[PDB]
Amino acid sequence: GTKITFYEDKNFQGRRYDCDCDCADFHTYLSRCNSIKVEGGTWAVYERPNFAGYMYILPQGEYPEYQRWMGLNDRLSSCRAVHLPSGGQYKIQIFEKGDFSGQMYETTEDCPSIMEQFHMREIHSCKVLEGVWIFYELPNYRGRQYLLDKKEYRKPIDWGAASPAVQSFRRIVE
Numbered sequence: 001g002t003k004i005t006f007y008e009d010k011n012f013q014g015r016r017y018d019c020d021c022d023c024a025d026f027h028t029y030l031s032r033c034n035s036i037k038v039e040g041g042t043w044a045v046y047e048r049p050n051f052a053g054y055m056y057i058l059p060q061g062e063y064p065e066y067q068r069w070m071g072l073n074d075r076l077s078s079c080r081a082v083h084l085p086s087g088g089q090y091k092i093q094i095f096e097k098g099d100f101s102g103q104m105y106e107t108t109e110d111c112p113s114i115m116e117q118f119h120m121r122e123i124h125s126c127k128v129l130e131g132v133w134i135f136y137e138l139p140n141y142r143g144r145q146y147l148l149d150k151k152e153y154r155k156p157i158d159w160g161a162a163s164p165a166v167q168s169f170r171r172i173v174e
Contacts, residue, residue: 002041002081004058010034011064022080025049033076036063042082042174044147045069049077055160057082057134057145059174070145082132082149082172090131090171092148098124099154110170113139122164126153132172135159139167 001020008014008030017029027049036045038060047053056069063069094114096102105118108130114120116139123135128148137143146159146166156164 001039002043003039004041004043004045004079005037005039006030006033006045006076006079007035007037008032010066012037012062019079024051024078026079027077030077032074033071034066034074036066036069037061038063042084042172044080044082045076046078046080047073047075051078051080052160055145055147057147057172057174070142082147084132084172085130088131088173090133091129092131092133092169093127093129094118094120094123094169095125095127096120096123100125100127110168112141112168112170114167114169115139121167123166124156124164126159127151128153133169134172135161135166136168136170137161137165141168141170143167 003020006017012035017026038058042059046055054072058069066074091108093106095104111117133148135146153159
């Protein structure tokens with residue numbers, strides 16, 4: 001079973017909140033989060049209610065400090081389980097310009113440096129055809145994370161980003 005437990009204090013202490021399903025807002029049960037136990041499944045956790053603000057992907061495991069999930073602050077108030085479609089197939093299309101224009105690349109593999117492999121500094125639109133992916137602001141899967149589990153992303157705001165700054169991406173196999 002997929003469930004996740006948020007703790008207000010590090011090393012799994014203090015006020016806690018259990019969750020086995022998508023939760024669009026748990027700020028009335030939890031005001032900070034400094035440690036997490038993901039008992040089952042892979043989860044996207046979000047700084048703000050309704051899956052907004054900074055987001056982080058957490059596979060199963062125990063996280064005693066929020067930096068362990070690349071947290072940027074000790075605030076989380078929404079979360080949702082990442083459900084991988086069966087078969088384990090992954091395919092994405094990235095575009096240099098918005099609304100699916102500019103040069104397009106289609107790949108089924110991870111990319112630790114978009115500037116190196118495709119000679120782009122930004123991604124302005126994208127189409128997720130199979131599987132679930134993550135965009136990262138920096139190379140080698142670092143910086144801000146963005147979950148891509150939908151199909152059409154016409155602008156960077158469609159994946160939660162305020163800029164087209166994307167520089168690596170990978171599949172959620174975890």
